[PDB]
């Protein structure tokens, strides 16, 4: 599992 | 603005 | 399970 | 404005 | 189960 | 199961 | 505007 | 399972 | 703008 | 599994 | 602006 | 702008 994003 | 998450 | 969004 | 959730 | 929305 | 949307 | 989800 | 979107 | 996800 | 995107 | 994550 | 990911 993990986390991430785009901005 | 942005999009993201944590699994 | 997790959480996320778009703004 | 936005959309999101927690499962 | 969980929660979420759109605004 | 899950959740989602379009706006 | 956007579309997305969590499964 | 996971999450994703388009904006 | 963008598109992305986490599996 | 993993994560990725295009912006 | 940017995109990134942690697995 | 860019595209990328983590497997």
Author numbering:
A (entry chain B), B (entry chain A), C (entry chain B), D (entry chain A), E (entry chain B), F (entry chain B), ...: 58 to 64
What sentences appear in the manuscript?
Although other intermediate filament proteins have been demonstrated to form amyloids, KRT8 specifically has not previously been characterized as an amyloid-forming protein. This protein, like other alpha-keratin proteins, contains a central coiled-coil domain that is flanked by an amino-terminal head domain and a carboxy-terminal tail domain, which are both low complexity in sequence composition. KRT8 is known to aggregate pathologically, primarily in the form of MDBs in liver disease. Atomic structures of KRT8 LARKS reveal that pathogenic mutations convert the non-pleated wild-type protein into a pleated conformation, shedding light on the molecular mechanisms underlying aggregation-promoting mutations in low-complexity proteins.
To assess the structural impacts of the disease-associated mutations, we determined the atomic structures of several LARKS from KRT8 for both the wild-type and mutant sequences. Segment crystal structures of KRT858–64 (wild type: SGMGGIT; G62C: SGMGCIT) for the wild-type protein and KRT8-G62C were determined. The wild-type fibril contains an anti-parallel beta-sheet, with PEG and ethanol molecules bound along the fibril axis. The central glycine residues (Gly61 and Gly62) adopt a nearly linear beta-strand conformation. Alignment of the beta-strands from both structures highlights that the G62C mutation results in the non-pleated Gly62 converting to a pleated conformation as Cys62 (shown in inset). e, Comparison of the KRT852-58-G55A GGYAGAS segment with a structure from hnRNPA1 whose sequences closely match the corresponding KRT8 wild-type (hnRNPA1: GGGYGGS versus KRT8: GGYGGAS) shows a similar trend in transitioning from an extended beta-sheet in the wild type to a pleated conformation in the mutant. An overlay of both wild-type–mutant structure pairs highlights that mutations from wild-type glycines facilitate a transition in the backbone from a non-ideal, highly extended conformation to a pleated one. Suggesting an effect of alcohol on KRT8 aggregation, two of three of our crystal structures of KRT8 segments showed the peptides in complex with either ethanol or isopropanol, each with distinct binding sites. The wild-type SGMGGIT structure (a) shows two ethanol molecules (gray) per asymmetric unit coordinated to the N terminus of the peptide, while mutant SGMGCIT (b) displays isopropanol binding alongside the middle of the peptide along the fibril axis, occupying the space between the beta-sheets (in gray) in the steric zipper. Both structures illustrate that alcohols can directly associate with KRT8 amyloid fibrils.
